[PDB]
């Protein structure tokens, strides 16, 4: 196992030991059924990968200086043009929905028709970092841990924005300037009685 989410508590019997990122965390027993646990595994891996890409993009835009993740689609609501890396994109919102819908429909349709494949390999791994399944167990643990961390980070991005109105980098700088005076307990939104 990867560890213990509750030091001293017995791990659930429905969680296999060879499962990556198995910390024995299942208080609600959601993955008790073997069929549900199989779907939950690929769902968590897909969510982790999407959240990793999303958090990386949200941090990259603010670090480079093109606004935050929330202000990015503000060009399509009131007379604006999309700018990727400071370069004007010649596509309107109507063309973006068609391209994205068709592309995502085709990709996700092939993925769904595959039959719940979590680790495809081959064309998706040109460098061959997981050619042998012996060392792939340790690399999968890093992927699931980074995915869970990125999921928590994206949830934190959404919550901190909905509570203050600033981007993740701006909130980090404000917290660094005043840690005790600028946190979730001082925004007047999270805890109403503070």
């Amino acid at each position: 196992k990867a560890g213990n989410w509750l030091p001293g508590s017995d791990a659930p019997a429905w969680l296999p030991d060879d499962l990556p990122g198995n910390y024995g965390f299942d208080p609600l027993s959601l993955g008790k059924e073997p069929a549900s646990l199989k779907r939950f595994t690929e769902s968590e891996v897909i969510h982790g990968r999407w959240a990793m890409l999303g958090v990386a993009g949200s941090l990259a835009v603010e670090l480079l200086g093109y606004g935050n993740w929330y202000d990015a689609p503000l060009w399509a609501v009131n007379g604006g043009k999309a700018t990727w890396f400071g370069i004007e994109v010649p596509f309107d919102l109507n063309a973006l929905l068609a391209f994205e819908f068709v592309a995502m429909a085709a990709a996700e349709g092939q993925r769904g028709d595959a039959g719940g494949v979590v680790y495809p390999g081959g064309a998706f791994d040109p460098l061959g970092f997981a050619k042998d399944s012996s060392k792939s167990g340790e690399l999968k643990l890093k992927e699931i841990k980074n995915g869970r961390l990125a999921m928590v980070a994206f949830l934190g991005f959404v919550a901190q924005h909905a509570a203050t109105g600033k981007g993740p980098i701006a909130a980090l700088g404000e917290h660094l300037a005043n840690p005790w005076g600028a946190n979730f307990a001082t925004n007047g939104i999270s805890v109403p009685f503070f």
Partner: protein, 217 residues
Amino acid sequence: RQSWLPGSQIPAHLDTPAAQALAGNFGFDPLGLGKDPVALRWYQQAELIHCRTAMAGVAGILIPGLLTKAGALNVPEWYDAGKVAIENSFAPWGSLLAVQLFLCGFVEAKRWQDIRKPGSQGEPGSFLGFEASLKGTSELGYPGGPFDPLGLSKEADKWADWKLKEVKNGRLAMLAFLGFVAQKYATGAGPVDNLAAHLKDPWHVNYATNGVSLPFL
């Protein structure tokens, strides 16, 4: 067999050898809340935590208050020290309470897991090697390792006496804090002020003359 009421029938659940091993067993349980052994064990842990917390708080209220009466210190009253301390502070009370809740929740959760499973906090490779010292002794609520640095619990001859001095004192402290609240709602002054006012004239300055504790007189 010491009893809280000479002649009263001691409950059967407080006369068992397991219950008699607890410190300060005086057969006091009129409501019968400790009939269940599991409930008795949980309440024993709660009483120990209450005793230690009340002793620390009452000490922090009485000693600085007694030193303030003299010229040793200038600590304000316990019911007003929070505002004075938060005025010239680096953080608001909300942020401080949040940090406190997180830090206290971690250790309280570890203590809770140890209560549910004794010695379970000694799981290898879980607390950076410090898990070996996180295993309590054979008695619940009395851990060693980092706690008790002087090693005064290793001597068994005084052990049974030491526990008797911890619960009893704690119980007294638990009542002291209660008085500290009642007096605050009956006189409007601090505990040392009430003690001095009573010592000046006990036959006329007491709870029978405050006009609150005896509304029918």
